């Protein structure tokens with residue numbers, strides 16, 4: 378029944394998944410980045426070199442200036458704008474219209490991406506991390522309070538881009554196998570708990586507290602699988618050992634160097650699979666999501682339809698905890714079940730795989746003392 382929401386996401390390889398959103402009156406449709414790592418709805422509202430279009434508040438009769446500024450600094454980039462509210466709809470999303478808070482971005486630094494084709498960002502996380510503070514109600518909260526749309530959305534990000542953002546439910550055609558759920562530990566970022574990490578079936582053997590030191594979150598707006606320094610180092614040592622058939626320069630594993638292969642010759646088979654075990658919904662029960670090199674090895678903006686496929690190792694370090702970005706999400710259909718405070722994972726019907734291996738979601742496994750893996 379959610380068919381009209383299927384394939385409502387677009388994007389350029391490595392630049393961000395976006396959905397169309399129509400704001401104001403008369404209608405002003407813009408391409409908006411789907412971001413589960415933040416909670417502010419904001420759109421470019423002034424000309425910018427990297428922006429094809431922008432929000433023109435003076436042309437919207439329903440726009441209400443809140444007479445207050447807002448500044449938002451992200452892990453990457455930042456912007457400044459004016460707060461206000463206007464009518465908002467998602468053409469290929471739920472059949473409703475709501476009055477939501479909207480930040481009109483007038484200035485920014487290293488936020489927008491040249492050629493990405495998106496002009497704003499939809500922060501889908503909770504109010505706790507919204508700017509200026511948690512009193513600025515996020516878009517999804519307004520949606521649920523003003524309409525009968527169920528408190529849940531799901532994301533199918535298809536990498537090389539496109540995908541689907543199903544709002545108010547789950548579309549069975551977007552995944553195979555069963556959906557496995559992990560609890561949302563706290564409602565601020567979409568925080569989860571990783572209890573075990575394996576490289577080609579081999580346990581990384583680190584104290585699970587290190588996997589979530591600070592926190593572990595799911596962010597559709599982050600490209601890589603980012604890991605805490607100590608975890609990153611151990612993971613890389615293990616991945617290098619498992620892919621010893623061919624040697625690569627140190628810089629490759631640091632994302633400083635790229636390696637290209639003749640079209641259709643990338644030796645996926647020499648790279649290991651990576652499994653992250655997440656806390657399940659029942660005591661001492663966990664499940665695992667497994668990604669292939671096709672997920673963690675990202676394609677880089679082609680030179681011009683050349684006979685060379687260049688890739689970048691998309692697993693990198695973080696000083697603010699684990700971030701399960703696009704590298705993780707592209708292999709699965711992810712359900713953000715806000716209503717039941719849980720996130721579900723299932724094999725995506727569009728994840729890129731080969732004839733030898735496939736991304737997977739498997740369970741259940743017995744894992745004790747999972748509660749002690751979270752940071753307080």
Ligand SMILES: C[C@@]1(N)Cc2cccc(c2)/C=C\C(c2ccccc2)=N\C(=O)c2cc(cc(-c3ccccc3C#N)c2)COC1=O
Nearest residue numbers: 391392393414415451452453454597598599600601693703
């Ligand atoms: C909350 C927010 N998600 C906001 C945000 C900030 C800056 C840019 C974007 C979004 C645009 C979309 C984009 C994507 C997303 C999926 C697919 C393709 C591109 N992401 C990036 O480009 C991006 C985003 C972030 C860190 C690095 C980043 C920085 C340094 C080292 C490694 C990195 C990675 N990964 C790169 C931190 O993300 C955020 O703060």
